[PDB]
């Protein structure tokens, strides 16, 4: 399963990659509706004030342990959060149809794993606010939509997942 790694015993900090979307938060920011060739644009500014990290600590790895170990090897998100960054998406609705697009935040998944016998014994998780992602769909009051379009039941990555590690010392 997901706990079988090929690493010497010890504690590691891992970069699971950018592009992670969270469970059921799909439509928290709202959606946009356009039609007949109109261009629709949605965007945002991950201002520190809003974009806050999601911590999932374990016994061996508390919040602080996770933060310091992530910001030591990978991008220091605490410093970066002070500088506003924007992102936008645009799409043109079809000639005689309606377009719906909704926005959600993306994150960088970081992990603190405890290895023992090539198997993960403990796993802490951190989601650092990254940018955003939009999903589109064309429609008309008739159509029935696959509900998976609107809902994500399990955290996942819209890009290819990653596993970039570094053994923690001390």
């Amino acid at each position: 399963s997901i706990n079988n790694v090929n690493l010497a015993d010890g504690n590691y900090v891992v970069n699971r990659g950018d592009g992670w979307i969270l469970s059921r938060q799909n439509q928290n920011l709202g959606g946009n509706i356009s039609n007949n060739g109109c261009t629709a644009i949605v965007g945002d500014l991950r201002i520190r004030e809003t974009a806050t990290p999601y911590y999932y600590p374990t016994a061996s790895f508390n919040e602080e342990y996770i933060k310091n170990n992530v910001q030591n090897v990978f991008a220091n998100f605490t410093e970066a959060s002070e500088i506003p960054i924007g992102f936008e998406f645009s799409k043109t609705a079809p000639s005689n149809k309606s377009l719906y697009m909704y926005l959600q935040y993306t994150y960088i998944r970081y992990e603190i794993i405890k290895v023992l016998q090539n198997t993960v014994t403990e796993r802490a998780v951190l989601y650092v606010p990254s940018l955003g992602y939009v999903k589109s769909i064309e429609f008309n009051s008739e159509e029935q939509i696959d509900k998976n379009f609107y809902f994500t039941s399990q955290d996942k990555c819209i890009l290819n997942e990653k596993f970039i590690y570094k053994k923690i010392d001390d």
């Binding site: 059921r24 938060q25 060739g37 109109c38 629709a40 949605v42 965007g43 645009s90």
Partner: peptide, 28 residues
């Protein structure tokens, strides 16, 4: 249910852009 954070504030922008053809006027 959905873990909604903000209920009465938003930093999320939305904008619509439309160009009228050479032959007619458009209502937006």
């Amino acid at each position: 249910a959905f873990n909604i954070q903000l209920f009465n504030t938003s930093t999320t922008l939305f904008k619509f852009v439309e160009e009228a053809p050479t032959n007619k006027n458009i209502s937006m």
